[PDB]
């Protein structure tokens, strides 16, 4: 039947509509974009002389194209026939592949949605689907892409995640309030995801094995899927689909790529609520698979060992789950699932794991919270005071930033600012930084003040080297570029740069959240944790932090965290995880003995 229908359709190619018919017809992506524009335009969407008489021709076009693509995808041959190499099946697949380019499908999947929003008086503004772009239209694109083209290469899988799937997963995790989660777009996005996207990722899980260079994207995927799972208004089938996708991906991820996911689970698994079952199974599977990554000091070979941060997080998992289970009453399924988690974590943790006395100051537990999961709390810089010795670096970096700004303006093409020419848009005045008025010092100086005060508040030493900076301090516009692209930071420098970028994101998120609350709605995609952000969104904060650190390093001001361990704190009689575990085990056994005595 599929072969007959495909042959009839190709014999009569006018069945594909104005698009896809060739001879000047634009592509599927262009047709869908034009349909969206028509739906926006009242003149063509309606007649202009319950659905009732209204047709919403834009939605009609979208539905027609989605139905055609769905029919072709269902007419695509099956993988067993393809592997057998039967000529008719190969020919049909090639015909469909020629008819529909892959770029069209990827673009239609990348097309964004309209989101329900909150308006003043706290009411819900929900765009109508009968006159708009629906997730079903992309559920057909996914079906065709899987049936005809298929995803069997890691690069294409990751690209499609970052362009088409991850924005929608984030967009459905953002609609997790009581008012929005029960609306239409959330309810359709949940169906679309849990029936098309998540099963596709589950089937393509083995392609997630060697994604060590896309951590910023896989972390976003994991966090958004976990938030979707935590969300409400999900049916049992949707929850099961989320669970199987998350387990399948986490079972192929490298041990070091689930650090932030574990850091999020340490706050939810101890609660031992109904939601704490899929995390409780993720922990079991992860610590049964990657136990060598934690136990053996050598590691797992290619993957290495833990950084003591993952070890501390695992110890916190074990103790929190243990204490919470001790306090909790008996539930059959919860106690059937918790014990394997405890056993796996205990096996993963080395017995002689001594607790890290070096507890890093100001860990970002305040960046998130309970039931909010995102509280932007920047580090206070008002009470801290600037050092008197860093003014030279202030002036140098302000001048360098102004020079880069002037170079960007010259690339834009604006001419030298001899006079204030706003009519010709030569208004920035483009002068040497010395000649810039002292009133305009702040626009370049103040971000540097914020960055230095944040680094000071984090208890960091910006220490100046006598052997590197003494000769430096002794020693109409021609801007000079301090080309720091080749300047490379160290590993700890990268860690501090990432911390500062996260702080910048927290500042921006707090300001934008205050503005959003003032406006009474309009959620922004970027009001999500820095860990949940993707690399292309973290790029500008990361570049700012790296630029500041690179300028400090070039000028010679070495930035160091600069905390020393007061003492080694060996206590093999006190600090060992095995010692604490045995102490509590003996205590519990003695308590049980006393209870049985009475």
């Amino acid at each position: 039947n599929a072969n007959v229908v495909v042959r009839l359709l190709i014999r009569r190619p006018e069945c594909f509509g104005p698009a896809l018919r060739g001879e000047g017809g634009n592509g599927l992506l262009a047709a869908m974009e034009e349909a969206i524009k028509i739906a926006e335009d009242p003149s063509r969407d309606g007649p202009s002389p319950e659905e009732d008489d209204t047709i919403h021709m834009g939605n009609a076009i979208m539905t027609f194209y989605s139905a055609l693509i769905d029919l072709l995808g269902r007419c695509a041959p099956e993988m067993h026939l393809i592997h057998a190499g039967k000529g008719e099946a190969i020919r049909i697949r090639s015909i469909l592949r020629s008819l529909i380019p892959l770029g069209d499908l990827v673009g239609v999947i990348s097309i964004a949605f309209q989101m329900p929003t909150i308006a003043k008086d706290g009411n819900v503004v929900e765009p109508d689907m009968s006159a708009g772009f629906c997730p079903d239209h992309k559920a057909a694109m996914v079906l065709f892409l899987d049936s005809v083209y298929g995803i069997e290469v890691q690069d294409f899988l990751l690209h499609l995640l970052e362009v088409g799937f991850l924005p929608d997963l984030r967009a459905a995790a953002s609609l997790d309030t009581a008012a929005l989660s029960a609306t239409d777009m959330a309810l359709a996005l949940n169906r679309y995801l849990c029936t098309a996207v998540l099963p596709l990722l589950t089937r393509c899980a083995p392609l997630f094995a060697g994604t060590e260079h896309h951590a910023s994207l896989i972390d976003s995927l994991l966090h958004t899927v976990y938030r979707l799972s935590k969300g409400c208004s999900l049916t049992k089938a949707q929850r099961d689909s989320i669970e199987v996708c998350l387990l399948s991906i986490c079972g192929q991820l490298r041990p070091s790529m689930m650090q932030h996911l574990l850091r999020r689970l340490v706050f939810d698994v101890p609660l031992l609520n109904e939601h704490a079952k899929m995390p409780l199974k993720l922990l079991t599977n992860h610590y049964e698979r990657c136990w060598k990554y934690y136990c053996l000091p050598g590691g797992w070979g290619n993957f290495g060992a833990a950084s003591e941060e993952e070890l501390h997080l695992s110890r916190k998992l074990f103790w929190g789950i243990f204490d919470a289970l001790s306090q909790k009453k008996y539930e059959q399924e919860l106690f059937k699932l918790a014990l394997p988690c405890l056993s796996a974590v205990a096996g993963a943790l080395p017995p002689d794991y001594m607790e890290s006395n070096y507890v890093s100051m100001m860990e970002k537990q305040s960046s998130m919270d309970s039931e909010g999961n995102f509280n932007p709390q920047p580090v206070d810089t008002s009470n801290i005071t600037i050092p008197e010795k860093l003014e030279y670096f202030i002036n140098k970096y302000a001048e360098h930033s102004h020079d880069k700004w002037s170079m960007d303006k010259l690339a834009n093409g604006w001419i030298y600012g001899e006079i204030y020419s706003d009519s010709s848009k030569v208004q920035p005045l483009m002068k040497p930084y010395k000649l810039l008025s002292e009133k305009e010092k702040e626009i370049y100086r103040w971000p540097i003040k914020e960055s230095l005060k944040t680094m000071l508040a984090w208890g960091w030493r910006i220490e100046r080297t006598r052997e590197g900076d003494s000769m430096a301090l002794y020693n109409g516009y021609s801007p000079r570029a301090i080309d720091m692209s080749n300047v490379t930071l160290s590993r700890d420098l990268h860690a501090m740069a990432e911390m500062m970028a996260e702080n910048y994101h927290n500042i921006w998120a707090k300001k934008k959240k205050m503005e959003l609350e003032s406006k009474g709605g309009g959620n922004h995609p970027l009001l999500v944790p820095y860990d949940t952000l993707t690399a292309k969104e973290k790029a500008k904060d990361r570049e700012k932090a790296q630029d500041i650190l690179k300028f400090l390093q070039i000028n010679g001001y070495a930035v160091s965290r600069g905390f020393k361990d007061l003492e080694l704190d060996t206590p093999s009689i006190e600090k060992r995880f095995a010692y604490s575990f045995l102490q509590q085990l003996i205590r519990y056994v003695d308590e049980a003995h006393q209870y049985i005595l009475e």
Binding site: G468, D469, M471, A472, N475, R480, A481, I482, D483, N486, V487, T488, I554, G556
Partner: protein, 97 residues
């Protein structure tokens, strides 16, 4: 003198007067204090000992300065009297291994 290395990267020029066996070094157009006096018939291989702190590390620039032959003239007998710098395929970068 500490600079930003923005007009150009560090350009250390090595000069060998083979008639006198004298080795001199130029930092940024000024002769450095360090110098060497090698024995007659000594064969000196141009070399760089570098620890990688950047993707791009350095360049063996086989050019010349005022009143000095390039390295290719010394290396190749056919180009002994040719002041034009050259990098024939025989000259390549070897590394200790």
């Amino acid at each position: 003198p500490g600079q930003g290395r923005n007009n150009n990267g560090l350009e250390i020029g090595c000069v060998v007067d083979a008639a006198s066996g004298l080795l001199t070094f130029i930092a940024n157009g000024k002769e450095l204090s360090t110098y060497y006096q090698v024995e007659p018939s000594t064969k000196l291989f141009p070399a760089v000992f570098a620890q990688a702190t950047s993707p791009n590390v350095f360049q063996f620039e086989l050019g010349r300065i005022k009143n000095v032959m390039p390295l290719s003239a010394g290396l190749f007998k056919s180009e002994h009297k040719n002041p034009v710098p050259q990098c024939p395929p025989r000259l390549h970068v070897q590394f200790l291994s």
